[PDB]
From a paper:
Bacterial periplasmic binding proteins (PBP) are receptors for extracellular solutes in metabolite uptake, chemotaxis, and intercellular communication processes. The PBPs collectively constitute a structural protein superfamily characterized by two pseudo-symmetric domains that are linked by a hinge formed by two or three β-strands connecting the domains; a ligand-binding site is situated at the interface between the two domains. Solute binding induces a conformational change to form a closed state in which the ligand is bound at the domain interface and buried by the surrounding protein. We have characterized the stability, determined the ligand-binding properties, and solved the X-ray crystal structures of the apo and ligand-bound forms of a thermophilic periplasmic ribose-binding protein from the hyperthermophile Thermotoga maritima (tmRBP), the mesophilic homolog, ecRBP, of which has been studied in detail.
The apo-protein was crystallized using a construct that consisted of residues 30–310 (numbering according to NCBI NP 228766), containing a M142A mutation to prevent expression of the in-frame ORF. The construct used to crystallize the apo-form of tmRBP was a C-terminally truncated form of the protein (13 amino acids). However, superimposition of the tmRBP ribose complex C-terminal domain onto the C-terminal region of the apo protein suggests that these this region does not form interdomain interactions in the absence of ligand. The apo-protein and ribose-complex diffract to 1.4 Å and 2.15 Å resolution and were refined to Rcryst/Rfree values of 18.0/20.3 and 19.3/22.3 respectively. The apo-form of tmRBP was solved by separately searching with the amino- and carboxy-terminal domains of the ribose-bound form of tmRBP. However, the relative inter-domain angles differ significantly (43° for ecRBP; 28° and 20° for the two molecules in the tmRBP unit). The two molecules found in the tmRBP asymmetric unit differ in the inter-domain closure angle by 10°, analogous to the conformational heterogeneity observed in ecRBP. Molecule B is related to molecule A by a 10° closing about the hinge. This movement is limited to one of the two strands (residues 101–106) which connect the two domains. The positions of four bound water molecules are conserved (separated by less than 1.5Å in the aligned structures) in the open forms of ecRBP and tmRBP.
Author numbering: 2 to 281
Write the structure that this text describes.
């Protein structure tokens, strides 16, 4: 059998790992697999779907370019009797894809908020107020808000923690440096910074270092090598959340295999868990 891997782009290592891992796993499970690159263009994606259908692929492993724009493509595959398993990104429709597998950003935010409170209440057990800042990801991106909302679902229950600044740094390291530099001038009372990803945590740390604010504790998300090393080295970044993209890609392929072997009972919306990383 053959599986088509339709990836949103290959211009970012995150997506390359997803596509290549899926192809590898399909081959391990005895299938042929081919990667199709949509190049962040829903029209290119649509053309790939039509080619894939015409060529009679047995399953599609899909990373959509747009949660709305990609719906019609999955519907055409469904009408052609080709099962679709989404990975990393989803579509805003049910009953079309067999399953939509994604990293549990909301739960990661919950884990991060829990540790934020644990760590900071250990450092500051008596403080009436623990002011902090939040760096958001890209405002239009679902992961931005799943992470932030998860964090706040925990931290907002502890009124002593006071968010005195909240701003996007675009999931970007250099932007986070600039934004953090400004936040430190405007809100020097902060004791901590919660960051929607590791790139932004690294930028925040460099801004803190430049300001001599080595006392401020920083919390991130992704499990990037540089942040894991910073945490392990006892730097002021003290936590992150590890994601498992290879497990996500492999799960989509494994479920596709299971489906072709006759299984039909799959949940449609499928979070793949994440894990807290700390000094200790």
């Amino acid at each position: 059998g053959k599986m088509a891997i339709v990836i949103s782009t290959l211009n970012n290592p995150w997506f390359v790992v997803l596509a290549e891992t899926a192809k590898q796993r399909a081959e391990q499970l005895g299938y042929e697999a081919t990667i199709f690159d949509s190049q962040n263009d829903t029209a290119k994606e649509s053309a790939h779907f039509d080619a894939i259908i015409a060529a009679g692929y047995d399953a599609i492993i899909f990373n959509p370019t747009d949660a709305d724009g990609s719906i019609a493509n999955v519907k055409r595959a469904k009408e052609a009797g080709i099962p679709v398993f989404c990975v990393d990104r989803g579509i805003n429709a049910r009953g079309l894809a067999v399953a939509q597998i994604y990293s549990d950003n909301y739960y990661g935010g919950v884990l991060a908020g829990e540790y934020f409170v644990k760590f900071l209440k250990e450092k500051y057990p008596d403080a009436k107020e623990i002011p902090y800042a939040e760096l958001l990801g890209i405002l239009s991106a679902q992961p931005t808000w799943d992470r932030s909302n998860g964090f706040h679902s925990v931290v907002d229950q502890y009124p002593e923690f006071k968010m005195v600044a909240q701003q996007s740094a675009e999931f970007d390291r250099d932007t986070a440096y600039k934004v953090t530099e400004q936040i430190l001038q405007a809100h020097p009372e902060i004791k901590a910074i919660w960051c929607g990803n590791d790139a932004m945590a690294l930028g925040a740390m460099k801004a803190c270092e430049a300001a001599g604010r080595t006392d401020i504790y920083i919390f991130g998300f992704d499990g990037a090598e540089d942040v894991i090393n910073a945490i392990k080295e006892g730097k002021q970044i003290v936590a992150t959340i590890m994601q498992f993209p290879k497990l996500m890609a492999r799960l989509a392929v494994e479920w596709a295999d299971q489906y072709l072997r006759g299984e039909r009972s799959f949940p449609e919306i499928v979070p793949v868990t994440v894990e807290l990383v700390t000094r200790e």
